[PDB]
């Protein structure tokens with residue numbers, strides 16, 4: 001005998017509501033029933049002998065999860081620690097960077113940055129008083145990989161032309177909205193060519209795609225284990241190479257491990273073990289999830305290849321149903337993850353305060369589609385979220401990009417092709433309802 | 441009706457029957473009925489993730505906020521939930537805009553919690569010296585007037601050096617040692633001197649009356665998971681609406697931040713993806729403590745009365761004393777400190793000249809050399825669990841070790857007699873040099 005087959009037969013191993021269809025695993029993730037049992041096993045041990053377990057078994061269990069995730073990512077264990085989530089990790093980097101005294105440091109970032117990380121940038125500048133500022137790089141999707149590379153090299157060239165210093169850049173592994181594989185290998189590589197700190201936001205990363213940490217060699221990398229590695233909610237892996245760990249002077253929040261102003265566990269690794277009393281049972285389950293995905297399922301590569309294959313083929317099915325298309329570039333490099341974006345068969349029309357000149361391909365593509373007006377776009381956007389939840393018992397996040405709604409579907413090992421055919425209707429049935437102005 | 445207190449109440453908890461929890465104040469524990477609430481919220485989250493986590497989270501957060509604000513007798517618009525007390529005080533210190541002249545000073549007492557004290561050090565490092573601090577040393581047993589006078593002088597001395605006392609962090613109940621702190625007198629002085637009163641009340645809710653309305657602090661944090669029978673990883677953050685604008689960003693910064701139901705309350709709903717089931721259980725722990733245990737007033741009345749009579753029993757057994765001032769105001773919480781019957785040799789680099797009463801209380805007592813003080817401290821911690829199946833934190837103060845015992849509603853006098861005999865035999869083996 002061997003690993004379990006994928007598809008709806010795998011739902012027996014999970015704890016989803018059978019009447020609910022989880023097309024949006026990429027937002028909060030979920031865990032199999034066995035990992036939920038492990039999580040409550042750590043809860044039980046924590047309340048049986050609180051002080052003996054929380055004081056001296058927390059470092060032991062953390063080190064077991066650190067060695068389990070480090071071998072998966074194929075990095076030295078001394079380079080990985082656990083934090084609350086991707087939002088927490090990104091702040092740990094941005095709040096710790098000592099900016100140059102001359103006030104020219106600039107944070108380069110793309111306009112598809114996760115909203116929380118973007119607002120973390122906005123405030124870091126407010127709190128740090130304008131010693132640093134930010135330059136947003138507008139990306140146009142579907143985006144060819146070389147055009148993204150070109151726009152980032154153009155932002156550096158422009159930054160220096162205004163006498164400023166591109167200091168740090170945040171880079172997605174897989175972007176949130178739209179759910180798209182980002183060419184982070186090239187942008188990270190040029191960050192070192194131009195001596196720019198690479199802060200890799202890879203929240204949509206571990207468990208879904210190969211992060212290639214040893215090869216890309218980033219200065220910092222964040223990734224949510226609870227998103228695609230079946231780790232309980234509230235866990236991210238924080239990778240820092242030893243050359244740059246001295247820059248993480250304080251954790252978030254500051255705790256006992258901080259040092260103001262031999263030869264065992266490093267002070268960096270020690271500082272992340274106790275950062276305030278929390279439930280660490282999700283951190284403990286990381287070694288269980290990696291074990292379960294390997295022993296019960298085929299392993300990481302068999303998991304990832306199925307999801308990506310299902311994301312392309314299934315995204316293509318809902319695209320052929322709706323009569324639109326998938327979000328993809330000419331190199332086929334955007335759908336290199338478990339998520340896929342499909343355009344909905346209508347448009348919202350020009351907004352006068354912010355007009356959009358679409359390319360010929362985009363205008364040509366919309367010919368014949370039904371058009372609602374722009375005042376009702378936000379109203380229709382909220383109406384589709386409730387109806388999907390209330391009538392259809394599902395959730396589908398949608399990206400509003402250039403007068404098109406792009407639905408983001410996320411494939412997973414407990415899903416199959418019939419789950420997209422169902423997604424085809426619901427989106428098409430519901431899109432037939434917005435054309436009839438039902439949201440009013 | 442109300443359940444009786446004592447060892448019979450251990451039925452309702454899920455502690456190891458071989459383990460004696462004398463150390464509730466460190467991490468707390470929850471009854472089984474709150475454990476099944478925690479797992480219910482966890483199960484609802486995994487059943488329908490996006491529908492439950494996006495739209496049922498704010499409703500459940502508001503239900504716990506209404507419950508925790510109703511018990512604090514404060515407006516619901518004043519309270520939000522943060523991860524822990526450490527996270528709460530980091531939210532205050534990391535948001536305060538310090539004066540441009542670089543004269544602002546953070547005032548604190550040397551009994552501050554280590555993480556909170558370390559937070560001051562980093563903030564000073566993070567703000568590149570635009571703000572500094574001043575540590576007020578304290579000697580325990582500390583009379584309330586001496587603490588107030590040490591704070592008044594710190595204010596007077598701060599101004600005499602061209603500095604401005606800007607912010608003071610005040611304990612409701614200190615950690616090590618576990619003592620009720622005269623925060624009411626210190627917060628009132630903070631108002632008169634126009635000093636931000638950042639009240640660290642981690643050892644607070646469920647254990648002592650915080651009298652927030654009377655004291656009217658600028659900020660207050662308190663761990664529900666310590667003494668409110670709330671699952672681990674929960675602290676209630678109180679902010680009056682007059683300073684809510686000072687809290688610019690949560691920790692970490694999330695969607696609710698506004699770059700330059702109120703926005704302050706909304707900003708704390710979604711602050712990075714976490715397990716919020718501990719926050720959701722606050723409403724249930726409060727309701728369980730009301731019906732099953734008989735109400736909030738009855739619980740903390742029993743625990744401190746038990747801490748007094750139990751702490752005195754331990755002191756009688758060891759032949760030493762409880763940590764208490766002449767007013768009897770230190771043991772006004774569910775914790776008590778008892779001196780152990782030995783002494784540490786004088787540290788030659790950091791000599792501590794004892795008062796006459798301190799030196800007479802240590803006469804005839806066995807003495808450990810200071811070079812062995814850390815070795816004996818680690819030995820007692822290992823033996824207390826491996827051989828006695830319990831944990832007792834000890835405060836090293838003025839060449840003495842003070843053991844901090846945490847009273848609880850599931851304990852009774854027989855538990856503190858056990859601790860006294862356990863500690864007596866433990867120190868007898870220390871006197872024999874067993875730690876070598």
Ligand SMILES: C[N+](C)(C)[C@@H](Cc1c[nH]c(SO)n1)C(=O)O
Pocket residue numbers: 054055256274276277465466467
């Ligand atoms: C064991 N520990 C949680 C790391 C703490 C001990 C401790 C006691 N009480 C608390 S509550 O945050 N922590 C430390 O040693 O710094």
